């Protein structure tokens, strides 16, 4: 078709429709949502990215970058059939300056590879998610929370500059001192404004030791959930969690536990965690000291860490939702707990809920001031918890299944003003219509995002079904 001929004339490498590699390059992370691209560009340099974008614009098709392909909604494929997919995973080089400790990271680099290179070359790191196969592109442009985030912030907070290919093929560099409006927009909503062709990240010196631990929670009835969660949020909100401590609740039908990573040794951990244990009347278990990379591996749930193979094909079948909330009033705790015990525990699929200890007085995430970037959730009191709700099937996903997580989220949002909750596009939820998605993902920053979208991509070349809409001018 026209897009294929345009790419050929422009000397852009592609994955041909009738090739083995099409299957891999086109594949979703979420097997519930396959889409068939119009074509797949396979750039090895920024020039190819420019040429691919220009071809999309000239021919009249939509285009989307795909970095790691982990979008829960397959938005790296366009979120619908018939987009040019700019597959970035042949571009995964990571370079670390020995002097400034700034890393230059190609946009197809996955987190495991990044972590490995930074650590092996200079004992450096930046703050990012668990899951070594996750692409740096989608992850860092919309937040990126992990087991260093209470200590060191979101992946987006370590971005120091970026080179971007705009919808008309122009090149720009964005930083605090250059195209600062674009730099603001990128840092929370980056999928909407261009294709990032190179990232520069600051780093911190990796701690020599980290200690993983677990605290099993007796959340077997609604009363225990309410009381335990009520104590836990009160503790976090009141400054109970030290900067070195990074933690979450993981819940499923069969166990609930706190899981943490303490940036320090086991004895430091025991001392630091004692007050919470006394508050919750629980005990520590599975206390394990690690070197930095062993710490990453512990929560990676992956044999492969340093992943660079374009054959990468990890996938699951699922529905997922997210939330960001303040502390919850007890009546909301009660409804959420009732749903957990009476509904979630009886759902005959592999579901889980993660509640990250996200905000509060000591969190590096919510220390970032409210004007620093488009990412919306920076208030230390109002943005206390981050949630991932995940509903996985091993056969095909049942078409009536969505009511489960939808109902659970309603138990939260019913009792919270819209100013006290939002949602997180790194757990992209295609159940949300376009208007609602923009509002819940970006909240108070939507209006400015829409203005910058009109300035930078007025034709919506980078469209997907939950993309920011250009402001009307
Ligand atoms: C599958 C998976 C996802 C995880 C995992 N662990 C996470 C964690 O511990 N913390 C988190 O905060 N998030 C975790 N996630 C979710 C991922 O963070 C999100 O799914 C990311 O958005 C995925 O990034 P990526 O793998 O790059 O996904 P794509 O589908 O390729 O892109 C998503 C989105 O971003 C746009 N985009 C990609 N690349 C670019 C560039 N270079 N420039 C602009 N825009 C870009 C895409 O077009 C798309 O819209 C653990 C697991 C197992
Ligand atoms: C990533 O970095 C490697 C260097 O480590 C680049 O590899 C070189 O590629 C050129 C031409 O493609 C070869 O002539 C060299 O021999 C390669 N060097 C080595 C040491 O292998 C590679 O080009 C870079 N990849 C990207 C996408 O930019
Ligand atoms: C490519 O896109 C950019 C932004 O969409 C255009 O640059 C802008 O041009 C306007 C007026 O022409 C200026 O007022 C802005 O300040 C520019 N923005 C930036 C970021 O440079 C650029 O003109 C476009 N190029 C073409 C050929 O259309
Ligand atoms: C502590 O870290 C060092 C590397 O910094 C590592 O060699 C050692 O094994 C770690 N100790 C423990 C108990 O994990
Ligand atoms: C919840 O379980 C605890 C024991 O784990 C019990 O003491 C408590 O009474 C239970 N509450 C209700 C309402 O069943
Ligand atoms: C644990 O860390 C503390 C620093 O907080 C240090 O004083 C102590 O030496 C460490 N313990 C061991 C066994 O290294």
- Per the structure, the count of domains in the chain is 2
413 lines ligand 2 (CB under 6 A): no
Cβ neighbours of 473 (radius 10 Å): 7
208 lines ligand 4 (CB under 6 A): yes
First to last CA, the chain: 34
Joined together, the tokens standing for residue 144 give 């990126």
95 lines ligand 2 (CB under 6 A): no
Residue nearest to atom 3 of ligand 1 (CA): 70
Taking the C-alpha atoms of residue 82 and residue 67, their distance in angstroms, rounded to an integer, is 18
Taking the C-alpha atoms of residue 115 and residue 305, their distance in angstroms, rounded to an integer, is 9
Q: Give the domain extent around 301.
A: 209-437
Q: Which residue has the tokens 């909330």?
A: 325
Same structural domain, 27 and 147: yes
Same structural domain, 65 and 85: yes
Are 389 and 336 within 8 A, CB to CB? no
Q: Choose among 107, 58, 130, 103: nearest CA to 204.
A: 103
Same structural domain, 303 and 442: no
CA of 195 to the centre of ligand 1 (A): 14
Assign residue 262 the CATH number of its domain: 3.40.462.20
Dihedrals phi, psi of 259, to nearest 5 degrees:
-130, 130
Taking the C-alpha atoms of residue 7 and residue 85, their distance in angstroms, rounded to an integer, is 12
166 lines ligand 3 (CB under 6 A): yes
Technique behind the model: X-ray
270 lines ligand 4 (CB under 6 A): no
Same structural domain, 148 and 268: no
Taking the C-alpha atoms of residue 73 and residue 430, their distance in angstroms, rounded to an integer, is 6
Taking the C-alpha atoms of residue 201 and residue 141, their distance in angstroms, rounded to an integer, is 12
Same structural domain, 71 and 143: yes
Contacts with 224 (C-beta within 8 Å, 6 or more apart), sequence order: 217, 218
How far is residue 165 from each of residues 31, 90, 261, 299, 392, measured CA to CA in Å?
30, 17, 37, 34, 36
Same structural domain, 133 and 74: yes
CA of 144 to the centre of ligand 1 (A): 8
Q: Give the β-pairing of 39-41 and 84-87.
A: parallel
Are 162 and 202 within 8 A, CB to CB? no
Q: Choose among 385, 381, 380: nearest CA to 368.
A: 380
HEC sequence for the chain: CHHHHHHHHCCCCEECCCCHHHHHHCCCCECCCCCCCCEEECCCCHHHHHHHHHHHHHHCCCEEEECCCCCCCCHHHCCCCCCEEEECCCCCCEEECCCCCCEEECCCCEHHHHHHHHHHHHCEECCCCCCCCCEHHHHHHCCCCCCCHHHHCCHHHHEEEEEEECCCCCEEEEECCECHHHHHHHHHHHHHCCEEEEEEECCEECCCCEEEEEEECCCCCHHHHHHHHHHHHHHHHCCCCCCCEEEEEEEECCEEEEEEEECCCHHHHHHHHHHHHHHHCCCCEEEEEECHHHHHHHHHCCCCCCCCCCCCCCCEEEEEEEEEECCCCHHHHHHHHHHHHHCHHHCCCEEEEEEEECCCCCCCCCCCCCCCCCCCCCCCCCCCEEEEEEEEECCCCCCCCHHHHHHHHHHHHCCCCHHHEECCHHHCCCCCCHHHHHHHHHHHHHHHHHHHHHHHCCCCCCCCCCCCCCCCC
Largest CA distance in the chain: 69
Q: Which residue has the tokens 């990232």?
A: 199
Contacts with 448 (C-beta within 8 Å, 6 or more apart), sequence order: 184, 185, 374
Residue 449 C-alpha from the chain's centroid = 19
Same structural domain, 229 and 203: no
163 lines ligand 4 (CB under 6 A): no
CA of 208 to the centre of ligand 4 (A): 6
Q: Which residue has the tokens 């040429």?
A: 51
Q: Is 376 left (phi over 0), alpha (psi -120 to 50) or beta?
A: alpha
Q: Cα dihedral sign for 352, 312, 39, 162?
A: positive
Pocket, ligand 1, Cβ cutoff 6 A: 29, 64-72, 75-76, 88, 107, 129-131, 133-135, 137-139, 141-146, 190-191, 195-196, 426, 464
Taking the C-alpha atoms of residue 162 and residue 201, their distance in angstroms, rounded to an integer, is 9
Assign residue 124 the CATH number of its domain: 3.30.465.10
Taking the C-alpha atoms of residue 22 and residue 37, their distance in angstroms, rounded to an integer, is 10
CA of 110 to the centre of ligand 1 (A): 10
Taking the C-alpha atoms of residue 25 and residue 222, their distance in angstroms, rounded to an integer, is 45
Same structural domain, 250 and 394: yes
How many Cα atoms are found within 13 Å in the side-chain-facing hemisphere of 264? 15
Which ligand is in closest contact with the Cα of 209?
A: 4
Same structural domain, 279 and 315: yes
Are 162 and 183 within 8 A, CB to CB? yes
Same structural domain, 192 and 236: no
Same structural domain, 295 and 151: no
How far is residue 470 from each of residues 80, 375, 461, 465, 467, measured CA to CA in Å?
20, 18, 11, 13, 9
Taking the C-alpha atoms of residue 6 and residue 54, their distance in angstroms, rounded to an integer, is 9
CA of 294 to the centre of ligand 4 (A): 9
Q: Which residue has the tokens 């009307």?
A: 472
Are 171 and 46 within 8 A, CB to CB? yes
91 lines ligand 2 (CB under 6 A): yes
Same structural domain, 173 and 281: no
Q: Which residue has the tokens 């939507």?
A: 446
Which ligand is in closest contact with the Cα of 338?
A: 5
Taking the C-alpha atoms of residue 173 and residue 91, their distance in angstroms, rounded to an integer, is 18
Taking the C-alpha atoms of residue 246 and residue 259, their distance in angstroms, rounded to an integer, is 8
CA of 30 to the centre of ligand 3 (A): 37
| 388 assigned ligand-binding residue | yes
| 248 assigned ligand-binding residue | yes
């Amino acid at each position: 078709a026209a897009i294929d001929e345009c790419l050929k004339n422009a000397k852009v490498p592609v994955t041909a429709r009738n090739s083995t590699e099409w299957k891999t390059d086109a594949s979703p992370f979420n097997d519930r949502l396959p889409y068939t691209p119009a074509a797949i560009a396979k750039p090895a340099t920024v020039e190819h990215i420019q040429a691919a974008v220009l071809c999309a614009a000239e021919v009249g098709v939509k285009a989307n970058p795909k970095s790691g392909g982990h979008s829960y909604a397959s938005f790296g494929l366009g979120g619908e059939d018939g987009h040019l997919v700019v597959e970035l995973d042949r571009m995964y080089n990571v370079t670390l300056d020995p002097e400034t400790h700034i890393a230059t990271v190609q946009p197809g680099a996955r987190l495991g590879h990044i972590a490995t290179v930074l650590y092996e070359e200079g004992k450096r790191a930046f703050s990012h998610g668990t899951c070594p196969g996750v692409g740096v592109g989608g992850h860092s442009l919309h937040g990126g929370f992990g087991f260093s985030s209470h200590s060191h912030g979101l992946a987006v907070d370590w971005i120091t500059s970026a080179d971007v290919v705009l919808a008309n093929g122009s090149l720009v560099t964005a930083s605090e001192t250059e195209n600062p409006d674009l730099f603001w927009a990128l840092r929370g909503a980056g999928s909407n404004f261009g294709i990032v062709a190179s990232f520069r990240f600051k780093t911190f010196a990796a701690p020599p030791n980290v200690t993983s631990y677990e605290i099993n929670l007796p959340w077997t009835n609604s009363s225990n959930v309410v009381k335990g969660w009520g104590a836990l949020q009160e503790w976090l909100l009141n400054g109970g969690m030290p900067e070195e401590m990074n933690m979450r609740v993981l819940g499923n039908a069969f166990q609930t536990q706190l899981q943490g990573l303490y940036h320090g040794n086991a004895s430091a951990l025991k001392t630091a965690i004692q007050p919470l244990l006394a508050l919750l009347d629980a005990n520590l278990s599975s206390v394990q000291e690690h070197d930095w990379m062993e710490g990453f591996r512990h929560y990676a749930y992956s044999g492969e860490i340093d992943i660079t193979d374009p054959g990468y094909d990890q996938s699951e079948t699922f529905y997922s939702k997210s939330l960001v909330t303040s502390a919850l009033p007890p009546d909301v705790l009660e409804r959420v707990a009732e749903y957990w015990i009476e509904t979630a525990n009886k759902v005959r699929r592999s579901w889980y809920i993660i509640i990250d200890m996200y905000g509060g007085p000591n969190s590096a995430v919510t220390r970032v001031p409210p004007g620093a970037g488009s990412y919306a959730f920076r208030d230390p009191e109002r943005h206390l918890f981050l949630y991932e709700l995940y509903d996985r099937s091993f056969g095909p996903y049942p078409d009536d299944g969505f009511a489960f997580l939808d109902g659970w989220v309603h138990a939260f949002t019913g009792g919270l003003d819209s100013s006290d909750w939002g949602m997180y596009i790194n757990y992209a939820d295609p159940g949300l219509d376009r208007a609602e998605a923009q509002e819940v993902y970006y909240r108070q920053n939507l209006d400015r995002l829409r203005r910058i979208k009109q300035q930078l991509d007025p034709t919506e070349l980078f469209y997907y079904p939950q993309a920011v809409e250009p402001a009307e001018v």
